[PDB]
Structures are given as structure tokens and as C-alpha cells.
Amino acid sequence: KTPLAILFMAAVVGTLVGLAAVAFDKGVAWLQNQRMGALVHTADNYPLLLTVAFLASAVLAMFGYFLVRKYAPEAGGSGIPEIEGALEDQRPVRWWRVLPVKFFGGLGTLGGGMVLGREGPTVQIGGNIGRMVLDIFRLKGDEARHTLLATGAAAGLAAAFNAPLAGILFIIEEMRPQFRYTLISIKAVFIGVIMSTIMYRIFNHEVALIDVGKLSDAPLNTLWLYLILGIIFGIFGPIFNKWVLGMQDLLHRVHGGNITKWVLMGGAIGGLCGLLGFVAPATSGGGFNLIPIATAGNFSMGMLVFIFVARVITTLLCFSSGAPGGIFAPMLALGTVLGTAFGMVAVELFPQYHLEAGTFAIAGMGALLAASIRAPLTGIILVLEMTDNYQLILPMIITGLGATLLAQFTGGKPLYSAILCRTLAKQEAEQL
Amino acid sequence: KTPLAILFMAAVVGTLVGLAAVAFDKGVAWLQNQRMGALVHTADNYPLLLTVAFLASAVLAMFGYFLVRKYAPEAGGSGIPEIEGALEDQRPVRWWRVLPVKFFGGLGTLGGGMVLGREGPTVQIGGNIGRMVLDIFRLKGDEARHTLLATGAAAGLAAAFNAPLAGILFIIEEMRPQFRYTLISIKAVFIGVIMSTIMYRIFNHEVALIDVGKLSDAPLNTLWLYLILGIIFGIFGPIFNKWVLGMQDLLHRVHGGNITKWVLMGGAIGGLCGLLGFVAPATSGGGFNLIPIATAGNFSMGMLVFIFVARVITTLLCFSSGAPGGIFAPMLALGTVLGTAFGMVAVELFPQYHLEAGTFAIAGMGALLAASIRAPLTGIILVLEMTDNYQLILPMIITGLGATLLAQFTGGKPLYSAILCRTLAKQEAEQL
Ligand SMILES: [Cl-]
Ligand SMILES: [Cl-]
Ligand SMILES: [Cl-]
Ligand SMILES: [Cl-]
After folding, report:
1. Which fold has domain B220-428?
2. Which sign does the torsion angle of CA B165, B167, B168, B171 carry?
3. Which residues in chain A are contacts of B165 at CB distance < 8 A?
4. Where are the domains of chain A?
5. Residues of B2-30 as b/e, b for ≥16 C-beta within 10 angstroms?
6. b/e map B112-151, b = 16+ CB within 10 Å
7. Phi, psi (5° rounding) for residue A77?
């Protein structure tokens, strides 16, 4: 009955996921530029600059926590576990509530300077837009419910990163298990991902979303050092996931689910990350402003160690508090400062290999998206599409598959699966 | 064990496809810039230069017509109606026989300035490489055979056009019908296609395969003219399909299968394309040269009529003779010439629209792929991502989905489906 109307509506999904995505990116960039642009006006007084860097980030984050805790308490956090749990018919898709809250409260949170990603809002906005097109064009059956939820979600990562290949390979490796799939479902997801990057590339004509320049090569007597980098990253992956879920119920003890104490904790958390945008800008922000600085070596090793310790204690504070933001971009810059700190000691230990710390940074950039969030194939092609260094593929397979092999040996679920089974275990804690 | 094995070999075949397609593209460009590098070296005798432009491209074509007729007769033509019949278990995949002569016979056919594409001898080289690494690794299953044959075929377009989105979308519209598809079959197709653009973007760092230079945006009040462009292409497409298969019948009358009369006819055809690649370079060649010159508005209206009738003669003279080469790039250069002629008779008839002949050439470029091959979604994502004009997506849909409306209404089969059902008619002719 529906051979081609589901493929027309998938292009309608992919058009809106790519128009509501680049309006989100232009809204967090307009808010970031006029929050840093509000500090150059009061540059004469130093304590007045710190006040309006705290308060302009606090009331932007308090605007984001209030919209989540009052109107849609599922837009908090990433939103990828809420779409991953909606494709299994376990979580509801309330697009009339999450779409004005993940957009406008996700702006205020990300444009306020919190250490959170563009991809968490965009994947959940895309999952709700695909339900919105499904509801305003009333389609029957679960055959169209889940193929319009798969697109939008896959079209969201395709517009949050300009990654059409990594957007489809995300939902293959994360949300859809080993079964048999209709070719119309595969066709409709492709039209939505294609329409998502087209609406990105209409309004964003730049290549190299992470622009580092074309770096050195990795010779084959060097590729064993990227296997050591997978051992370091594959151990930290499950350790970081214990810290994410360990602070989700540690910051939950500050409040008790009280909305007036959640937004006052999120305004102190959001105001601290706007305070750390003028004092030390390398320890806050979404992370994408740090990846090209850390790749082509500008830091020391004492500063690069300090950046890593200060960024893990702000990635945890931003994500686990219940703010509408992603976790890829805080962890892409977290694997870049760890790959550079590994790359800076590999130059000194092995001067006969003619090494470069930037090749270990681009290799280790998607090695935390392989160990912590166990999607190694998605994390490799994402870094290759963002950072156009395609000659660094054989170090990326060595460090991306050696990370996800030891992430299973040490014992670790994916992060979006571990968050989802902690929200499914609590929605069944009221329904006895 | 079993499923992770064929995912590893997908990266093996896609690396091998993307390296054999780069070596094919660099080898065709080496043979082209050696007979045209020795072109100005004979700038003292113009009748003798017309002889060493004929004969240097004739014996290059005679090497390509003899490798096909002696060794692998299933390597003559495109090769897309030999992998798409191989996925239906009707044609054999002789990777020890086709893969040498689709490479070395294609270096002399395409390097001799003939009107053929690289997408023909890279899909059949691609699908044979996936069968090549099925027998050297000794795999047993039949769907594990089909997911390695479709992996390299989809990696063939992705390393010929640098279009991974069009490589996946081509084996859904044209090569595979609707079924229940295993997830690792979809995953292994994705791995070989991303690994071939990785191998293509290591060597070729071009941001666009065709550079026309940011043509204008088409307003909504001008958007009805792309419907007439698809109406015109949707009629000519079925007419061009009967000319491909009619010149196939007409040229199989100089020779009844005779290998001496095949390669002497193929050397006169291939020597003429080296002859009319010096005195009139826009009538022969593969076609990727005059696409930036057509959309720039260089040719006049009486010249574009001369270019169209001469390129539609040398496309049927070359493809329907039996030469190992594709027909996409001759038909992208046939829709660009017909699209420029439409945009130049509409920029004078409608001065109120402030039109441009380039927006009708880019839109009309993939309107003959939607009419002859009848793969509309592939041809839209082929023209853009080769020409970075994503702001013409709404023109390209109307001359896209809308040129397949009159392609079916006129009574036109797809081209590769019409060659395959004609090849399989000769297959069951002698044996039955
Ligand atoms: Cl979350
Ligand atoms: Cl996320
Ligand atoms: Cl053919
Ligand atoms: Cl072809």
C-alpha cells in the first residue's frame, strides 16, 4: 500500500533534519559569539568580566535545565539512549514536548559554553522529527514507525558532523540488532541521510569540520605503537563509563529530583563552564575548538595532562547533571588530548621512527568512541570524515579495534546501552 | 567466526577495489597524456600528426578489442549487466580472466580517447575482486558470495566517482530487488565502500570530480522549467536505449563474431576517437572534460547542437561496438550538452527569471541516468558530490523524479536490464 510514500516522507524527514540541525548550529554559534563578545565590552574591569561570564552562562544553562525538568524530562542527557530505546518500543516519542525543549534548551546549554556535544540534541531532534512527519502524515503499522525513527536519528548524526557514512553506520552498530531488514527500510534511511547532508552542505560549504591540515604518515614499523594506544584507550573506556554512570547518581543526590534545586545545580555547573571559557578555554566548550590546537602540537605535556584532568571533571559535570547535550564531542577532544599525550612521549622514546604527535591524536580521537561507546566502525569513519586524513586509516583500525577488543576483555557495555538500561530499570521501578 | 570473517574480507576487497580503480584511473590518464603529450611534439607536419593521432589511438583500441574477444568476451561493454546478472546467479564471475583484460583492455580503450567511462571497468573489476577474495579465502556460503560480489560492485562506483553514497544507492535501485536483507550483508557492503573512498582520497585530494564553480540558485518561480527538462529527457532516454541496442545489432553485422573483423572495426572506431580528439576534442573522449566547459557557457547554440549530435554518434559507435568501457560519463556529458542547450533557449525566452545555462546543465546531467538507466536517486547523488552544487537539489529532483515519469510512460526499460536480458537470451540460445 505504501511503496513510495514512505520514501517521499523520508526525504521530508531528511529535509527537516538538516534545516532544524543547521539552525541549531547557527544558534549555538550565535550564542557563543555574543557571550564571548559580551566580555570584550567590559574588558576594563576584571571582576566585572568574571561576573558576566558566569551569569550569562548560568541563566543560559538554567534556561536549559528548566525546559528539561518541567516540560520533557527525557531531553536531559544525550538523547541517543532515548532514541535507541524508542526503536525497541520501550520509550515513548513525545515530539510535541522534546522538540521545543531539546532545541531551545539545548541551545542555551551548548551556547552557554557547557562541555557538551551537538550530536546528542541533533540525534534526538531527528528521532522526534521522524515521528512528527509520521504523525502529521498518518501512517499505519510499525513498519513505518521504526524506519522513520531510524532515519532522522541517522540523519541527525549526518548533519551534526557532516558524516553521511558514519550516520548510517551509527544506527547499524548501535540501535538495530542482528535481524533481517526490508529494502524499503534501507532505501528510506538513505534518502533521509542524503537529504540531511545536502541541507548541511547548502548552508555549510566548508570541508574539514576539524581542520588540522594533512599530517605525516604512519609507516608499518610504527603501527605497533597504535596497538599500545588501543590498550591504553580500551582500558580507560569502561573506566570512563563507570565515571559517567557514577556521577549520574552522585549529582542526583545533590537534589532529589527537585526542579528548583536541579536548575540551581545546573546553573552552577553551567556557569562554571562559562567561567572556564575566559580563564582556561581549553578545559570547556564542546571540544571542537581544542582538537585542531591539540593535534598540531601547541601544548606542553604538563599542560596537556592538566587539560585532560580538567576536561574529565567537566565532561562528567556537564553530562551527568541532566543537561541536554551530547557526549561524542566531549569525548572526541578527550581522546585527542590523550592521543597527543601518548604521541608526545612516543616521539621522545622512539626518535628513530620520525614520529609526529598529531598522528596519534587523530588515531586516538575515535578510540574513545570505540572503547567507551562500543562502535569502532562508526568512530573510525567519523574521524576520517571530520578530519580529512585518509592516509591515517591503518593506524585507526589498529587503535580502534585494539580498543574495542580490550573494552570487552576488561568488561564494559556501550555507554548509550548502559544509560538506557538504567532509565528502563527506573521506569519499571514505579510500575511494579 | 562466521559473521566477522566476511566483514574483514569486505575491508580487504574494498581496499583492493579502490587500489585497482586508482591504478586504472592513473593508468588511463597516463596513456592519455602520452599520446597527447606526443601531440605537440609533431607540430611540424599536420597531415602526419593526423596519422599519429589515429594510429596511436587505434592500436591502443585494438589492444582493448583483442583482449576481450580472445580471452574474456564477458568483459566487452560496460560490465554492469554482468555483475547484476551475477548477483542473480545467471552469469559466471571469471576473476582470473576478466580482471586482467578489463584492466589492460580498459587502459587501451579509455586511454585511446574513446567515448567510454571508467565506471564500467571498475564495477566489473570491483565485482570480480570480491569473487577473487572468496576463492583465495575459500568461502562456502551462497549469500556470503553475494555480499562480497555486491560489496566490490558498490565499491566500484565509489572509487570511480568518489561517491560512496551513490555506490550504495546504485546496487539497490539497479542490482538488487526487494528481499529480507541480513544486517551483516548491509554492514559488509558499507565497509568495502568506505574503504574504497579511503583508498581514493589517499591519492586524489580533489574536493569535486567536476569543477563548475558554484552556479546560481534556482528560485521557485523558475522551477517549472526543470519539469520540461525532465519531460524532454524522459522521452529521449527510451529513444537512446533503442539506439544503444540498435547499434549493438547494427555493428554485429560487419563481423559475425570474427576476431579479425572485430578488432579491425574496433580500431577504426577507436582510431576515429583519437582522430576527433585533436581536431574536435569536445566530440570524443570520456566526457569529463567538456562538462566544466558546457556549464561555463563557452559553446554557442549552433556549436552545442554539433557537440550533441557528434557525441551521441560516438557514444553508440564506442559502447555498442563491444569495447570495455562504461556509459555513465558519456551520458553525463550528453545530459550536460542537452541541458546547456535547454538553459540557453530558456535564458533568452525568460529574461524575467534571470536564468543561467549552468543550472540547467547540472540538473540535466543526471536526467539521462534517470531516463536510460532509470536509477533516479543514484543519479541525483551522483551529479552532486561530483559537482558541489547542493543548492540545486530541488531542480535536480524535478528533472530527476519526473524524468522517470515519462521514461515509463514512453515504454523504456532500464539500459543495463535491457542488455542483460539480451545477453541471457543468447546464453540460453545455443544450449537450449
Ligand atoms: Cl543520556
Ligand atoms: Cl551523544
Ligand atoms: Cl554492456
Ligand atoms: Cl556503465
Report:
1. Clc chloride channel (1.10.3080)
2. positive
3. 164-165, 190, 193-194
4. 5-203, 223-427
5. eeeebbebbbbbbbbbbbbbbebbebbee
6. bbbbbbbbbbbbbbbbbbbbbbbeeeebeeeebbbbbbbb
7. 75, -150
Q: Which residues pair with B117 in a beta bridge?
A: B326
Please tell me if residue B183 touches chain A, with a CB cutoff of 8 Å: yes
Q: Tell me, which fold does domain B3-203 have in CATH?
A: Clc chloride channel (1.10.3080)
- Taking the C-alpha atoms of residue B271 and residue B204, their distance in angstroms, rounded to an integer, is 30
- Architecture of A223-427 per CATH? Orthogonal Bundle (1.10)
Joined grid coordinates for residue B256: 559475425
Which of B178, B193, B201 is nearest residue A390 as measured by Cβ atoms? B201
Identical fold, A5-203 and A223-427: yes
Query: From the list B183, B207, B381, which residue is nearest A207 (CB)?
Result: B207
Closest to B80 in 3D by CA, of B386, B430, B429, B423: B423
Where do we find the cell 570541508?
A: A207
Confirm if B364 and B399 have CB atoms less than 8 A apart. yes
Q: Which architecture, in CATH terms, is A5-203?
A: Orthogonal Bundle (1.10)
CA A90 vs CA A131, A425, B228: distances in Å: 15, 11, 48
Experimental technique: cryo-EM
- CA A30/CA A51 separation, integer angstroms: 20
CA B136, B141, B142, B147 torsion: positive or negative? negative
User: Cβ–Cβ of B393/A186 closer than 8 Å?
Assistant: no
Q: Does B164 touch chain A (CB under 8 A)?
A: yes
